[PDB]
Amino acid sequence: NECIVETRTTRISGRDALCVDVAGALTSDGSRLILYPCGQQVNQKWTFHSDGTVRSLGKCLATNNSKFGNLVVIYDCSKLAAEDISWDVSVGGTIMNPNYEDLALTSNKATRSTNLTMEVNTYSASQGWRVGNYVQPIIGSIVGLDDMCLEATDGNTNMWLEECVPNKREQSWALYSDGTIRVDDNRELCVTASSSTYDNWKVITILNCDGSNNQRWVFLADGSISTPGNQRLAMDVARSDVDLKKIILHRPHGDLNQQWVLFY
């Protein structure tokens, strides 16, 4: 027990709960990294150092537009430039290289064995990651003002606040490493911010999970359920009125209609 941590070995999970995995356990200074089912295999262990470097199999994660294109690879840590093996992890689940400020680790397809790539950062669910050794989705209820629970309504098409009822299936949500909030009984379905509005603000509903930047949420210390980034918006019970049946995406102000509790 101490206030300084020198190095740690963990997993990185994301898109559809899959793990960052160096393809086939190859160690060639240039091998590629995929999404793959999470397991205990050593090619899914990642070690973070006081360097700012992230390492698997002894070699460290890297990105150079010239060397490997916009693909992400492991190389020899001494054989290539420092700037290309720096990494920063944000509270919102973005993994990026501080030197290439516009880019972010991405998985363009939701499928097993997809090549991981650096892409422009649009704060998409395909760009959301959980650094940590527990890779499973976190199941619970989401509780809002007046101690009411978020419910998936209308045959899993809409959502609003109803009275909490323990073990009610429609009130159970699964929080994925990619920052998606999914219907527990149907994991193809994601909490999503529509283009349809109410009082000139987007309305939250349930649509097919498609890896986009309106299905990605972060639970922060202010009690909000927010979008990742600087231009941040929070989930919000319209007019502090449960009966309106409308959850919207609003400017953050931290009042009771924007405060939530994960009841796991």
Partner: peptide
């Protein structure tokens, strides 16, 4: 000091008494 990673694992339980080992702030 290290990217939101814990120096040690904390063992928490959920309401179904399942163990959840937490090793970072990203939970």
């Amino acid at each position: 000091s290290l990217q939101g990673l814990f120096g040690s694992v904390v063992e928490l339980y959920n309401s179904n008494n399942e163990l959840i080992e937490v090793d970072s702030i990203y939970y």
